[PDB]
């Protein structure tokens, strides 16, 4: 059993070890961001990539290093080298780029950032599983903000209830 990289979503210099399951938006909400208060001039850092995983919705995106991706034997590693080459070409462009042009690039990154956050929001629930957990939660088939119905996903009911109870109540309405 192996995970597959679908898309590289972002890159950062982050606190060493601020990667994997503790960096999901829902781990962060429950326990705090592992990268909280990281100032790259006051502590050791490492290059981390935000990964959208094949077959997992955007709420499950995690930060990873080249090291953790290789240790976990993830598929889609050709995408890493591509992303690095793309990012190297952008840095180069920025280094010899107008203030105006650099200005428009930075607005585009903010809008993209905003769009990516929408993908982690359940817009509505459209099915539920017959089977419940021992704690009585079904799983829910979720339609995500800003994504087509093809990108709906089954999600753990206990998890979805923490933040999207109103969607649950609308669905059973």
């Amino acid at each position: 059993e192996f995970e597959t990289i679908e898309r590289f979503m972002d890159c950062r210099i982050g606190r060493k070890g601020a990667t994997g399951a503790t960096t999901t938006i829902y781990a962060v909400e429950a326990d705090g961001d592992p990268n909280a208060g990281f100032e790259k001039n006051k502590e050791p850092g490492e290059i981390q990539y935000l990964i959208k995983w094949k077959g997992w919705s955007h709420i499950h995106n995690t930060w990873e290093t080249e090291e953790t991706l290789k240790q976990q034997n993830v598929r889609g590693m050709k995408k890493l080298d591509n992303y690095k080459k793309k990012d190297q070409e952008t840095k180069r462009w920025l280094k010899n780029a107008s203030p105006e042009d650099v200005e428009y690039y930075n607005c585009q990154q903010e809008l993209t950032d905003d769009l990516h956050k929408q993908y982690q929001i359940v817009e509505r629930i459209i099915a539920h599983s017959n089977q419940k957990s021992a704690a009585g939660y079904p799983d829910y088939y979720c339609k995500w903000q800003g994504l087509p119905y093809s990108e709906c996903s089954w999600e753990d009911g206990a998890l979805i209830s923490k933040k999207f109870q109103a969607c649950i109540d609308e669905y059973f309405s």
Partner: peptide
């Protein structure tokens, strides 16, 4: 069961 979470 298609639903999972990151552990």
């Amino acid at each position: 069961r298609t639903a999972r979470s990151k552990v």
